[PDB]
Structures are given as structure tokens and as C-alpha cells.
Amino acid sequence: ECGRVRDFVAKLANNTHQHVFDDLRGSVSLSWVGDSTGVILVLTTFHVPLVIMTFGQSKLYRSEDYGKNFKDITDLINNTFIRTEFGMAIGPENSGKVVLTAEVSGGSRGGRIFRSSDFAKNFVQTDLPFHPLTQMMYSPQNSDYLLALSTENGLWVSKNFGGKWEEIHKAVCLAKWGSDNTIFFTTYANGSCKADLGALELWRTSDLGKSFKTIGVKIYSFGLGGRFLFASVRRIHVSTDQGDTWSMAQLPSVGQEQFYSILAANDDMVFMHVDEPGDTGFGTIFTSDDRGIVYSKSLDRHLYTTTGGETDFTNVTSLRGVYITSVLSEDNSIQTMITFDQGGRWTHLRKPENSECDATAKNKNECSLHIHASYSISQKLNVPMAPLSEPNAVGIVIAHGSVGDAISVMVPDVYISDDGGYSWTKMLEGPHYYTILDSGGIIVAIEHSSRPINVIKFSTDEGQCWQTYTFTRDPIYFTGLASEPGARSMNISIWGFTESFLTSQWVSYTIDFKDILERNCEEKDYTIWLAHSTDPEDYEDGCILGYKEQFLRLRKSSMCQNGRDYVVTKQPSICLCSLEDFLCDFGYYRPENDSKCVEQPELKGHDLEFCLYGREEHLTTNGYRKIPGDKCQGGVNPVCTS
Amino acid sequence: ECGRVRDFVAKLANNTHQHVFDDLRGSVSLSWVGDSTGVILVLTTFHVPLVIMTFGQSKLYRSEDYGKNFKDITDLINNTFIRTEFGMAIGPENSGKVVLTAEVSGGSRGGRIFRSSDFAKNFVQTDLPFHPLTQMMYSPQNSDYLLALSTENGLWVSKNFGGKWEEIHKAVCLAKWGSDNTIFFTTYANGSCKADLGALELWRTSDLGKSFKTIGVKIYSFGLGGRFLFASVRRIHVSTDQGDTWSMAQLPSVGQEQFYSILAANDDMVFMHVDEPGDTGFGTIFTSDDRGIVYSKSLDRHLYTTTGGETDFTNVTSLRGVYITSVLSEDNSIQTMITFDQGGRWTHLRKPENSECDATAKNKNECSLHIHASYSISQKLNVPMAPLSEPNAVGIVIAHGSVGDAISVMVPDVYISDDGGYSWTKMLEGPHYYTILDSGGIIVAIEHSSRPINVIKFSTDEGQCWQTYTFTRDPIYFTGLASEPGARSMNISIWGFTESFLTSQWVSYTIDFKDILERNCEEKDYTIWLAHSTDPEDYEDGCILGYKEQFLRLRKSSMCQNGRDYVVTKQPSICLCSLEDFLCDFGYYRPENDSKCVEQPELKGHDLEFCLYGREEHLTTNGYRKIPGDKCQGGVNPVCTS
Ligand SMILES: *[C@@H]1O[C@H](CO)[C@@H](O[C@@H]2O[C@H](CO)[C@@H](O[C@@H]3O[C@H](CO[C@H]4O[C@H](CO)[C@@H](O)[C@H](O)[C@@H]4O)[C@@H](O)[C@H](O[C@H]4O[C@H](CO)[C@@H](O)[C@H](O)[C@@H]4O)[C@@H]3O)[C@H](O)[C@H]2NC(C)=O)[C@H](O)[C@H]1NC(C)=O
Ligand SMILES: *[C@@H]1O[C@H](CO)[C@@H](O[C@@H]2O[C@H](CO)[C@@H](O[C@@H]3O[C@H](CO[C@H]4O[C@H](CO)[C@@H](O)[C@H](O)[C@@H]4O)[C@@H](O)[C@H](O[C@H]4O[C@H](CO)[C@@H](O)[C@H](O)[C@@H]4O)[C@@H]3O)[C@H](O)[C@H]2NC(C)=O)[C@H](O)[C@H]1NC(C)=O
Ligand SMILES: *[C@@H]1O[C@H](CO)[C@@H](O[C@@H]2O[C@H](CO)[C@@H](O[C@@H]3O[C@H](CO)[C@@H](O)[C@H](O)[C@@H]3O)[C@H](O)[C@H]2NC(C)=O)[C@H](O)[C@H]1NC(C)=O
Ligand SMILES: *[C@@H]1O[C@H](CO)[C@@H](O[C@@H]2O[C@H](CO)[C@@H](O[C@@H]3O[C@H](CO)[C@@H](O)[C@H](O)[C@@H]3O)[C@H](O)[C@H]2NC(C)=O)[C@H](O)[C@H]1NC(C)=O
Ligand SMILES: *[C@@H]1O[C@H](CO)[C@@H](O[C@@H]2O[C@H](CO)[C@@H](O)[C@H](O)[C@H]2NC(C)=O)[C@H](O)[C@H]1NC(C)=O
Ligand SMILES: *[C@@H]1O[C@H](CO)[C@@H](O[C@@H]2O[C@H](CO)[C@@H](O)[C@H](O)[C@H]2NC(C)=O)[C@H](O)[C@H]1NC(C)=O
């Protein structure tokens, strides 16, 4: 049914441009630099410990022909080499500023970082006054403010893009950026940074080092998500006033000292993972409020990695308000869940109809899909990539799955989704490396195996119809692929080395899908769909977090070029509030399957706290809270550190 | 000069026996079971998280024909599968008892472990009363006493080899064995085991659970090396009376709370690694005494992994009293050191003469050899195996090296040694997997690369002359190799899967080197050598730790079959004591290069402690202590927990 297009092999072979770099010692990196420019950097990095100094000139290449023809520019990288952990630090989006943190063969004063500002078309060298411990970090408000960490725990900042390097503090553990060039960092005061792990001091500077202000003492670490600011004392504190107020988080249970973990922090609320007594590897997800202080139960049996803390929690970026994670069950098996109201109510993933298990083993109960993510990756399962979802391409999600078999754990297979996670379908066999470009118009996949591959699998209709193309007759060992950074982008680049019967030489392939996408998608090529509605009312067919939006979708076998935004509703319409448009309240949880939020097995009734006590005004109510960000009206009536 | 033997390709091809297992889902394991029997087990294991229960029948194969012909015995492993972390637990040496810790597809009561006692020729099934968290541990005094850890932190013991399973304690964190069926284990008392990490209680039972005795409280963890017993409070305690006395270790420096790490514990002394202030990744090695209480400085700049604690410390098992580790230097480069008096005096590795750097770059100072070990492996360097040394084959050490270049860090190359580490020589290019058999008479190596290999490299004269053999025309992706477990053993087994243009099917190759080793090594094929002497006196040419022993060595191009012990001195002769026959004393260190132990920069003079104070009798002396185990006489005159 998927058919084909105007015989595509000729159009791809004309657009598949190969360049060979021959012998390149070390691991080869590759990255595009901006769109509508055709600049590709090829840097060789060495996995060398940071403490040791040694010789070696890392090679560097640059193509200004959209990857059609490269040019050796190692002349710049003379007597210098870049480590693998360092790599290439690419500027954010249209900044076009790349820095290469290198080290001299025998240099001792500091590293020789190479800076460019015109999308890596020409560089300017400079010598750091220190040996950098971490790669340069960018500032959000301006890309010309650089953060660095010295080997002697020295914090340096650059106001003029590597020009001047002033030091901020000499006893800095870790440091991050904040809203509008705000720099947060912890500080030790006795020998080693890691020696004072149980008690540090978190500072903050609003003027890039000139004004300091101690914001927190006796701390494990700190974080920064959304508009929030966190600090771990175990105990945890949430801050909104940039650290001026650290009201502790209050939770229903936590009998002893349950360990906490911030899953993800939206600009509205923040997810937190709290463990269970006796470890055992499961916990519960707590959903906060508009301030991130009071938390409500959201999900049980939440699996996490016992050694690390990673979990299958995934933010479906395609659809707003959809998240996916894996949990245990009554039969102690692996099952993944999904929510459509941002942690309000979770539900089981409906098994894919066009997949092979409902007819394979119906007598056996367990064969639900398991979307692999960071929990499976942390457990060293054969999972190359986490679920992928681009916000421009709404609904589109691609990930690795499993059907509750030991073979599917070793071989996950690749699943697709256009409903934003509500419905799935197995499309590819085995592990793959996939990428999304053209705002979902193209989805390229590459097989992950021990055998040298030479085939690329792509789909031009949002993963509905997959085509197979052999980009070369010399099978390469896959090293990686890169996408051109554009909303309308259509070139990609695959690179790897060939087995040439000794003397393995590298080679990069750059493919352009323009001649494939001849036709422009007319209105005859689209279909209109609505997000899944967990509400039974007919006048609420897609009110994700309050409002209803209509989206469009390329039809099957669509080999055309899209240029429209996948959301057709310019100004969305607000629906009346629903039961799923409301989050559970404190001390209340929504049991499995059912949709009515009931009381947690308690009767005494509590009333939170506020850091050093000073409790609430006691709001009883039932167990429903307006979801932070859910814009609806009517429908259902609701009831420390110095 | 190395020549060849009576055209060996025919003798190997007749002894190279191949068997194909076809499609085997999961990772394939293989292991011999005793010598002079020809039993090989081939088990497929799955890398599945322990918490989840799922379906799957793991396949099992057994060959009773020395690997010439296998036989499918999956009939036993019915509705059961073995995880990768579990694998096959092989009995110690001539016990011939193998257990396969499996799990039922839907079983919940406990695992179905399969036990055998006649070298895996026939098994007996049994159902565990619990889900095992760890693989069975063997007891030293008797192989029929099994230790296990339940998923609910339950400690179980088996008196009759899986027959009866009695529980010992319900709140057990970790547990190990001890001298004569003694079981040591820590215990928690508040919710989780890991929640009470700062304070546990270490118990001990001498009668397999009937009599308990609390031996230590407020503990991080515990260890057991040699005849010693350790407990971490940071602080560390050393015990000899099986835990009845925990006299704290005293060290010269340690200004604040330097972190400690026990490197290796001999039956005489014990090495300890103590970190430096500010981390930075280097520390000092401390050598203890005959009791392991008072420690002396031994080496500076000792590199360790900052995230984990691994270090290049290696026990050269071939020569008694030789150890190797890597340290920093004045030029902040990587250099490995070696001692011949068991931590008494370290010296730089003399650069290999027949290697390419002394003529490549003499103007540049740094190009010493760097023997890779656990420090490089922990840093994820391309190092497959640590240094290998079998005690039967004296002098023989094989390891991966480096010459202080970024390329040599990515590609280590394989170095050999017959002087026990004093002299080295590069023999093979690139990373390899190597093994030793025939008590050093055969040394097999296999190339480690991304390309499917079909060539085996071996040497029949203690790594002096290497030969190359192509064991098949179907290149396989190397999975692993196994050696027959015998002092006179001569079969090996290599297994892996072939790229068959999809449907990769497995295949195992078993090679016998008997027809290669026709001749028996007469006295015309040996040479006599003595261990390196760090002493200038001529009448002490090889007095390692006191006594002098004469060893023998197969000459170059020796293609014969040895049957003699490589140490010819039946009763060794005691040398008079030397300066290297004495260890530095407390508060004294031996500086670099020179051999005179001098004072640590201190003048006040201290006098140790004894747990709750009660200090010493103040023995001043200079800075020399008799090495624990060094048997010499004359020559040089020398001067907590409840
Ligand atoms: C799952 O993934 C989705 C992505 O689809 C995430 O949603 C994104 O959330 C981020 C924020 O977390 C959005 O990014 C930007 O947030 C800015 C907030 O910064 C302001 O903070 C304080 C608030 O008082 C201000 O005082 C301060 O001055 C900062 O300005 C917004 O300001 C941004 O708005 C921007 O929009 C226009 C668009 O062109 C810009 O030009 C403006 O300059 C303006 O700054 C923006 O909202 C991001 O937009 C969200 N994505 C989408 C698609 O909505 C979810 O957060 C994530 N889930 C979780 C749990 O993390
Ligand atoms: C570097 O590597 C070398 C290996 O070459 C290590 O040397 C080995 O050390 C181990 C011990 O650590 C030796 O193994 C055995 O140790 C036993 C000690 O157990 C006794 O402990 C107390 C002591 O009072 C006794 O009361 C108790 O009852 C135990 O018996 C010895 O007893 C062993 O002797 C055995 O020898 C014969 C040989 O046939 C046996 O049949 C006997 O049953 C007897 O038990 C043995 O010594 C091992 O032998 C050492 N190897 C060599 C080649 O000497 C180094 O320790 C290691 N370096 C470091 C730092 O760990
Ligand atoms: C995918 O790759 C192709 C080529 O590999 C890119 O097409 C190239 O786009 C550039 C930019 O427009 C073209 O250069 C232009 O040439 C004209 C005429 O010489 C000149 O007037 C412009 O100033 C500009 O230099 C280039 O000719 C063109 N090459 C081909 C073969 O079409 C394409 O842009 C890439 N895809 C994306 C999304 O960028
Ligand atoms: C390396 O492998 C070879 C074969 O792959 C092993 O040789 C085999 O050794 C066994 C044990 O002695 C021999 O079996 C014996 O056969 C005789 C006569 O039938 C019988 O009387 C004995 O009771 C015993 O069963 C077997 O014939 C022999 N095979 C060959 C081809 O020689 C060899 O032992 C292996 N190496 C080592 C070190 O074990
Ligand atoms: C760049 O590379 C060149 C050659 O590879 C280096 O030039 C040599 O430098 C040394 C000492 O720096 C001089 O003694 C030689 O005379 C130079 N060669 C020539 C032909 O003049 C140069 O050092 C490298 N750049 C840096 C910064 O080290
Ligand atoms: C061993 O394997 C056999 C077949 O693969 C299993 O036999 C079946 O068991 C189920 C329930 O246990 C019965 O309903 C079937 O009738 C059995 N098959 C036949 C042909 O009789 C057997 O269960 C497996 N062993 C275990 C312990 O599960």
C-alpha cells in the first residue's frame, strides 16, 4: 500500500556526496554549523585522561560546500589536540560561534582554545590562563558570556568571547547559569571540594562576579529547572525568588528519610521522584503546583535505576502535556504508562494492533509495549537512543520498544507514533539510530549492529511509509549521523570507517532529499486529527490542558514537501474544565484504571509546613487541584538554609 | 631468527575442531569444566534487569569430546533462563561442581538453580525458596557450603549443596566468607540497607548461622584480604583476631580526613592507598607491617580513578615480591613504576631497547613505557585486559603498553616480559585478548578490533617467538576464548558469530597444540636466569625478599613441550640482609631515584596510637624496618568499634 515515488534511487544517488578523510587517528566527530550556509566541521578527538599531558596534533577538516567537498584545516590546530570529553562546543542556534578547547603537546600554562564567530568560517586563536576542567558553558541572555571551571576548581568568565578571562572564585565545585546571566555555584572551604560533600555554600552573582551573595549552606548539591531553583540538604528545597526563599517541599508519605529526585521542571510545575523504603527499585512520582512547594501523588511502582537514579520518564515534546514512563505491575512485570494532562492521570498504553503478540500468546497475560528510555539505557540494555520527539512535528514520536520477552529486551525494535504516544506501531527491526528533520517531513534511521552497514531507511510521511536506500557499495561501520540545523532542513551527513582489509580509512556521506520532495503537499495530502481525550464528553475531543487544538498530518505514501505548521488552529478555543483538567490534591491519589481522585489511606488530616514551621490556613476540600497551566473555565466545580 | 617448526599448519588444522550452534539469542557464554575430562558448557544468558520477571528458555549445550562435538541439553533448562550477571558459577579447581542460577518464566516463589557434582556430566534440579539477588558464593574450607543473598536482603546458606536452604538473617546488606567457613556480613535496622550507609553492624558466625557475634558498629563497609579483616568508619580499622581487635591504622601525614583504599593484602603485609588534599587524582601508597597496623610511605604521585578509585596497581604473580603501578612525574606525564622488594623501593621501568621511540624522539624527554591496568580500564581507555601473570610460569608477564602519545593511548600494543617486569618488549600491535596455558608453554593472543577476525597468534617459548595461524576461512566477530584448566593443559576454545549477510550464526573453534609440541624440551632448550637485583653486591644477584632462587627459561624459537618447574632451586639459599631487604620505617620515606630511606619533613617525633589511645613504648631508630616475609640474616645492621 505504501507504494513508491518517481523512482527515487536516481534522485538520491545524485544528491549523495561522499568524501574520504583516509586515516584519522582517534574518534572522529562531525557537526553542522548553522543552516543556509553549508559548513561542516570534522574534528578528531582523543580519549585521554585530563590530568596527563602528552603530544599529538588533532586533525580538523571543514567543508563549505554543504558536505560535498571538504578541506584540510589542521594547519590551525598545530601542536594542539582536543580531548573527546571536550569536543566541539557549538553556539546556540543562530549565534554561529564555535569554540575548540584544545591542549598543547607540552604546554603547561593553559589551554589553547580556538574561537570563531562567523559560523566557523575563520577562527582566532587564544591561550587560556588556566587548564580547563570542563567545556565552556554558554550564557542564555548573551552568547558572548562564557563559563569555565579550572583544574584547580577556579571559576573563570569571559565577557568578550574568550578575549578577557577574569577569575570569579578559587574554591568552586560546580557552576551553572541562570535567568539573565545569573551564575550559581557552590563553594567549599576545607581542602577538597568532594571532601565537604555534606555541606557546601551556594553563591550567586548577578553582575558576572562583581557582587556575590551567599544563598545556601549545608547542601548536597543544587539544580535549576524551568523557573525553579533547587537545593538538597536527605532533604530538598525549592526556590522561586532566585534563592531568597527556600520553602521546603511537603509530601504526604515519606515516613523516614526517603530520597528525592527531580524528574523534570516545567515553567508551571515540577515533577519529583521519591523512593520507597528498602530501595527495591520503585518509587512514586509527585506533581507540584504553580510554585513547586506542595506535591500530590501521581503514579506508583515508578521504576528507577538503583545505581544512578535514571528512569524511563520522557517528555513527549510533540504534544503539549504528554509524558511517558515505565512502572511495575501486580505481576511484577515491566509496563510503560502515559499521561495526557501533565501528570494528572496516567493510563496503560493500548497495545499496537498491527503487531505480533495478540495472536502469538493471548493465554499469557503480559505482553504490553515497553518504551525504552534512560532506565533501560542506564541498565546497559541494547538501547541506542531514547525516545525522539521534535516540538515542530506535533504527534511524531519514535522510540525503541519491548513486548515483555527476554529477546525483546536484547532486540528492542523501533516503534513509531503519530498520536503523541496514544497509539504505536512497530516499523523497524532491531536497534536503530534515528533523527528527525524538515520539521518531521523526513525521518532517517540507521541500523545498529556489529555488521558494517550501507543502507539508510527513511520516511517522508511522518513514519507511516518507510523506504530503503543503499547509499554506498562500501559497507561502513557506523560512527554517527548529523542533521542540518534548520526547520526546513533537508541535508544529512553519515560518517564512518570501512574495513579495507587493514588500514581502515574514514568516509562521510551527505544526502540531500530535495529532489525526492518534488511536489509540495497540497490540501489533498493532509488529514486532520485531534489529541486523545481522556474525557467522555463529546464536546471535548482534544482539550489537552484546557484548550482544544486541531492538527494536520501527512497522509500515507506522501512523498511531497510540506511547508505548513502542523497545528492549524491559530487561536485555540478554551474548553470547559474537566476532571482530567484538574490535578489531585495533597494527600490524595488517583488509583489505577479508575479516574476518581480519592484519599490516601489517612484520616487525621494534615496541613503542610513552611520551612521553619508556620503552617498553612488549613484548606480541607476534597482532592482536586487546578493543573498549573491548564487554561479552562466552567464545566466541573472544584472544592532550611540561611 | 625465530624460524619455524616442522610446518605447523597441518598439525593445527587437524587439531582445530569447529562446531556451529547456529542462532543463539542473547550473549553466549562458554567455559571448560576440569582437565583430563573434556567437558565444555555453552550457556546463553540474557541481560535482563533482576526486578522484572519475563518469559524465555535459555539454551544450554555440553560437549564431552574436548569440544570436538557438542550436544543440545536445553531439555533440562525448560521454562527457565539464566541472566548475564548470574552466568555459570564454576566450582574451585578439582571440585567439579557447577550451579546455574536460573529463573522461571512466570515463577514467583524462587529461582530454579541446577546443580551438578560430577563435572557437569549430569545435573539435579531444585527450587530455591527465594529469588537470589547475587550468584552463589563458595566456601573455602568446603565447596558444599553455599552463600546466597535474597532480593529481600535475606542471607541463606546450604550445607548439602543446594539440598537444604536455611536462612541466617533477614537484614543483610553484603556478605562474604572467611577462614574455615566463617561468614561475615553487615546488618541494617531502619528500612533500607543503603539508607544506613554511615552506620551498619558487622556480624560473624563460625558455625554457619547458629552462633552470632556483633563485631563492629558505625561502619561504612568492610573487606577481607590475606589473613586480615578491615572495616571503614573517613576512618579505617585493621583486624587480625577475626574482628576481636580493631586497632586503627596510623599514618605519618593525613592532615584532615584523607580517604583510604586497601590496594592488596598479602599474608604478611597489606598495601593501602591514601589520597591527597584537593583530590586532583594522585595519592601515596602506604606499606604496613606483619600485623597491618603501622604504615610507612612507599610511593608518591600514585594515580587513581577519581570516580571509582581504581588504580594501575598490579601484583606480578610470576615473580614473588614484584608489583607494578603508574604514577605522575615532575612533567605531569604518565609513568609506571616497579618494585622488587614488595613495596620497599620503586624504580623506573627501563625503556625497551627493541622499541621505536629512543630513535624517534630523543629531544623530547617523555617516552617511557606505561603498562595499562585497572586505572586505564576504569577511564574507559581501549584496554581489553589487565596485565596477565601466572605463578607457575615465573617471569612471564604480558600486558598493554603506551609511550606517552595520544595515539598509544588509543592503541596500546601488546608488550611481553620474561624478567618479571624489569625488561619489556613490544610484540603485538593494537589491543589483544591473551591467555596463558601449559604453565607458560603456550601464550595465545587474539586481535581486538571492529573487523571480524580469523587469525590466532601464539608463542611456544614464553613470548619470545610469535607465530601466526589462521584457524578458519569464515572470519568471526570475537566474543571470547577459554583455556582448558590444567597445569599441562593444551586445548583452547574460541567462539563467536559470523556475519552471514543477515542471520548471524554462532561457531566455536577448539585448538589443540599437542602435535605442535612434538619434542620434549631437553636441557639444550633451557637457559638459567636470576631475578633482577637492586643491590650492588656481587654475591646477591637475585635475592628477592631475602633468598636467592635460580629459574629456567625456554630458549628462543623453542617449539618443544616442557614438563619441568621453572624454578630449579629446590631448597633456596638465604642471602645476607640488604638495604632493599628492609622496608622504610614510620615517618620515613625513600626519595626518588636514590636508595637511602630518609626522614619525612618532620622533627617533633611521634609515637603512633592504639585505638582508644594507649600509645607505644617510643622506638626511635632511623628509618628501616624488616620487610614482612623477608627471610635474611646478617649483612646490614638495622637500628574504634564495640
Ligand atoms: C517538555 O517540553 C516542552 C517543550 O515542548 C517544555 O515546554 C517549554 O518550556 C520552556 C520553559 O521551561 C519554554 O521556553 C521559554 O520559557 C521562558 C521563561 O523564561 C522567563 O522566565 C521568567 C518567568 O517570570 C521571566 O521573568 C523571564 O524574563 C524569562 O523570560 C519564556 O519567556 C519563553 O517565551 C519566549 O517566547 C518567544 C517565542 O519566540 C520568545 O521570542 C520570547 O523571547 C519569550 O522569551 C519560552 O516560553 C518553551 O517555550 C516551552 N515549549 C513550548 C513548545 O511551549 C516543557 O517545559 C517540558 N516539560 C518539562 C516538565 O520540563
Ligand atoms: C600476589 O600474588 C601472590 C601469588 O603468587 C600472593 O601470594 C599468595 O598468598 C596466598 C595467601 O594470601 C597464599 O595462599 C595460601 O595462604 C594460606 C594462609 O591461610 C592460613 O591462614 C592462617 C595463618 O595463621 C592459618 O591459621 C589458617 O589455618 C590458613 O591455613 C596458607 O595456609 C597456604 O599454604 C598452603 O600451602 C599448601 C600447598 O599445597 C596447601 O596444600 C596447604 O593446605 C596450605 O594451606 C597458602 O600459602 C599463596 O600460596 C601465595 N602464593 C604463592 C605463590 O606463594 C600474594 O599474596 C599476592 N600479593 C598480595 C599483596 O596479595
Ligand atoms: C542540501 O545540499 C544542497 C547542495 O548539496 C544545497 O543546495 C545549495 O544551496 C546553496 C545555497 O543557496 C546554493 O548556493 C547558491 O548558488 C547561487 C547560484 O550560484 C548563488 O547565487 C547563491 O548566492 C548561493 O551561493 C547551491 O548552488 C546549492 N547547490 C545545489 C547543488 O543545489 C541545499 O541548500 C541543502 N539543503 C538545505 C536545506 O540547505
Ligand atoms: C586436547 O584435545 C584432545 C582431543 O581433542 C585430547 O585428547 C583426548 O584425550 C582423551 C583422554 O585421554 C582420550 O580419550 C582416551 O581414549 C583412550 C582410547 O580410546 C581410552 O582408553 C581412555 O580411557 C580415554 O577415554 C582421547 O582419545 C584423546 N583424543 C585424541 C584425538 O587424542 C587431549 O587430552 C586434550 N588436551 C588435554 C591437555 O587434555
Ligand atoms: C607549528 O608547527 C611548526 C612546525 O610543525 C612549529 O615550528 C617549529 O617550532 C620549533 C619550536 O617552536 C622551532 O625550533 C622550529 O624551527 C620550527 N620549525 C620551523 C620550520 O621553523 C611550531 O612550533 C608550531 N607552533 C607552535 C605554537 O608550537
Ligand atoms: C517443560 O516444557 C513442557 C513443554 O514445553 C511443559 O509442558 C506443558 O506444561 C503445561 C503446564 O505446565 C501443560 O498444560 C501442558 O500440557 C504441558 N505440555 C504437554 C505436552 O503435556 C512443561 O510445563 C515444562 N516444565 C515446566 C516445569 O514448566
In B381-525, the DSSP E strands lie at 397-400, 414-417, 425-428, 432-437, 442-447, 455-459, 466-470, 476-483, 491-498, 506-512
Q: Which of A52, A80, A372, A403 to mutate to test the interface with B (most CBs of B within 10 A)?
A: A52
Residues in chain A closer than 8 A to B407 (CB atoms) = 25-26, 56
Contact A453, A478 (CB under 8 A): yes
> Measuring CA to CA, which residue among A356, A322, A521, A335 is closest to residue A441?
A521
> Measuring CA to CA, which residue among A271, A277, A243 is closest to residue A259?
A277
Q: Give SS3 for A358.
A: coil
How far CA B53 is from CA of A281, A369, B28, in Å, comes to: 14, 15, 21
**Residues paired with B73 in a beta bridge:** none
Q: Which of B27, B44, B52 to mutate to test the interface with A (most CBs of A within 10 A)?
A: B52
Beta carbons within 10 angstroms of residue B362's beta carbon: 9
> Measuring CA to CA, which residue among A553, A528, A548, A527 is closest to residue A537?
A548
**Sequence-ordered list of residues with C-beta below 8 angstroms from that of A190, at least 6 positions apart, any chain:** A196, B256
Cβ B266 under 6 angstroms from ligand 2: yes
- CB A25 to CB B410 under 8 A? yes
Which residues 482-521 in chain A show a CB within 8 A of chain B? 497, 499, 504
How many angstroms is the resolution? 3.5
**Residues paired with B338 in a beta bridge:** B324, B347
DSSP state of B577: P
Find the ligand nearest to A40 CA.
3
How far CA B527 is from CA of A560, B521, B553, B572, in Å, comes to: 79, 11, 5, 18
Contact B29, B19 (CB under 8 A): no
At A375, give phi and psi (nearest 5°): -65, -45
Q: Give SS3 for A238.
A: strand
The residue type at B182: T
Cell of B585: 620505617
Pairing verdict, β B491-498 and A112-116: unpaired
Ligand 2 nearest atom to the CA of residue B315, by list position: 1
How far is residue A396's CA from residue A408's CA, in Å, rounded to a whole number? 23
Find the ligand nearest to A287 CA.
1
How far is residue A413's CA from residue A403's CA, in Å, rounded to a whole number? 10
How far is residue B297's CA from residue A485's CA, in Å, rounded to a whole number? 57
> Measuring CA to CA, which residue among B66, B69, B44 is closest to residue B57?
B44
Cβ B66 under 6 angstroms from ligand 4: yes
At A195, give phi and psi (nearest 5°): -70, -35
Tell the burial category of A502 from Cβ atoms under 10 Å away from its Cβ (0-12, 13-18, 19+): exposed
Closest chain B residue to A56, measured at CA: B406
Element (H, E) at B10: helix B9-15
How far is residue A642's CA from residue A216's CA, in Å, rounded to a whole number? 6
Q: Is B379 left (phi over 0), alpha (psi -120 to 50) or beta?
A: alpha
| Residue length of chain B | 642
Q: Find the distance separating the first CA and the last CA of chain B, reported in whole Å.
A: 67
Q: What angle do CA B302, B304, B310 make, to 5 degrees?
A: 130
> Measuring CA to CA, which residue among B420, B418, B414, B474 is closest to residue B448?
B414
Contact A487, A507 (CB under 8 A): no
How far is residue A436's CA from residue A358's CA, in Å, rounded to a whole number? 30
How far CA B349 is from CA of B281, B297, B337, B361, B589, in Å, comes to: 22, 20, 6, 18, 20
**Sequence-ordered list of residues with C-beta below 8 angstroms from that of B225, at least 6 positions apart, any chain:** B262, B264, B265, B270
Contact A30, A19 (CB under 8 A): no
> Measuring CA to CA, which residue among B345, B353, B301, B290 is closest to residue B322?
B345
Nearest beta carbon to residue A54 from set B106, B328, B406: B406
3-state secondary structure string across A510-549: EEECCCCCCCECCHHHEEEEECCCCCCCCCCCCEECCEEC
Tell the burial category of A106 from Cβ atoms under 10 Å away from its Cβ (0-12, 13-18, 19+): middle
The residue type at A446: I
| Cα Rg of chain A, angstroms | 26
Q: Is A191 left (phi over 0), alpha (psi -120 to 50) or beta?
A: left
How far is residue A453's CA from residue A151's CA, in Å, rounded to a whole number? 41
**Sequence-ordered list of residues with C-beta below 8 angstroms from that of A229, at least 6 positions apart, any chain:** A178, A184, A222, A223, A238, A239, A240, A242, A243
> Measuring CA to CA, which residue among A33, A26, A220 is closest to residue A121?
A33
- CB A53 to CB B257 under 8 A? no
* Separation in Å, CA of A409 to nearest CA in chain B: 7
How far is residue B586's CA from residue B572's CA, in Å, rounded to a whole number? 31
At B10, give phi and psi (nearest 5°): -70, -40
- CB B406 to CB A81 under 8 A? yes
Cell of A586: 495533597
DSSP structure string for B129-176: SS-BSS--EE-SS-TT-EEEEBTTS-EEEESSSSS-EEEEESSEEEEE
How far is residue A167's CA from residue A128's CA, in Å, rounded to a whole number? 12
The residue type at A487: A
The residue type at A49: P
**Residues paired with B156 in a beta bridge:** B148, B167
Nearest beta carbon to residue B195 from set A54, A191, A257: A257
Nearest CA to ligand 1 atom 21: A227
| Cα torsion B359, B362, B363, B364: sign | positive
How far is residue B41's CA from residue B64's CA, in Å, rounded to a whole number? 9
How far is residue B156's CA from residue B167's CA, in Å, rounded to a whole number? 4
Residues in chain A closer than 8 A to B364 (CB atoms) = 55, 106
Find the Cα–Cα–Cα–Cα dihedral A28, A33, A35, A39, rounded to 10°.
-70
DSSP structure string for B346-409: EEEPPPPTTSSSTTT-SSSS--------HHHHHTT-S--S--B--SSSTT-EEEE---SBHHHH
How far CA B384 is from CA of B377, B398, B426, B497, in Å, comes to: 8, 12, 16, 19
How far is residue A78's CA from residue A349's CA, in Å, rounded to a whole number? 55
At A247, give phi and psi (nearest 5°): -60, 120
Q: Give SS3 for A447.
A: strand
- CB B332 to CB A48 under 8 A? no
Tell the burial category of A89 from Cβ atoms under 10 Å away from its Cβ (0-12, 13-18, 19+): middle
The residue type at A63: S
How far is residue B284's CA from residue A38's CA, in Å, rounded to a whole number? 53
DSSP structure string for B53-83: --B----EEEESSTTSS-EE-TTTS-SEEEE
Q: Which of B24, B45, B51, B188 to mutate to test the interface with A (most CBs of A within 10 A)?
A: B51
Per-residue burial over A298-327, b if 16 or more Cβ lie within 10 Å, else e, is: bbbbbbbbbeeebbbbbebbbbbbbbbbbb
> Measuring CA to CA, which residue among A390, A389, A409, A393 is closest to residue A401?
A409
- CB A332 to CB B195 under 8 A? no
Tell the burial category of A559 from Cβ atoms under 10 Å away from its Cβ (0-12, 13-18, 19+): buried
DSSP state of A561: B
Q: How far is ligand 3, taken at its centre, from the CA of residue A558, in Å?
A: 25
Nearest beta carbon to residue B405 from set A55, A282, A499: A55
CA A401 to chain centre: 18
- CB A410 to CB B46 under 8 A? yes
How far is residue A17's CA from residue A633's CA, in Å, rounded to a whole number? 56
| Cα Rg of chain B, angstroms | 26
Per-residue burial over B249-270, b if 16 or more Cβ lie within 10 Å, else e, is: bbbbebeeebbbbbbbbbebbb
How far is residue B497's CA from residue B475's CA, in Å, rounded to a whole number? 9
HSE toward the beta carbon, residue B385, CA cutoff 13 A: 22
**Sequence-ordered list of residues with C-beta below 8 angstroms from that of B192, at least 6 positions apart, any chain:** A277, A278, A279
* Separation in Å, CA of B289 to nearest CA in chain A: 29
Contact with chain A for residue B54, Cβ under 8 A: yes
Which residues 586-625 in chain B show a CB within 8 A of chain A? none
How far is residue A3's CA from residue A195's CA, in Å, rounded to a whole number? 64
Nearest beta carbon to residue A46 from set B54, B281, B410: B410
How far is residue B74's CA from residue B230's CA, in Å, rounded to a whole number? 44
Contact with chain B for residue A153, Cβ under 8 A: yes
Kindly list the protein residues whose Cβ atom lies closer than 6 A to any atom of ligand 5: A 78-79
- CB B332 to CB A256 under 8 A? no
Cell of A167: 577569575
| Residue length of chain A | 642
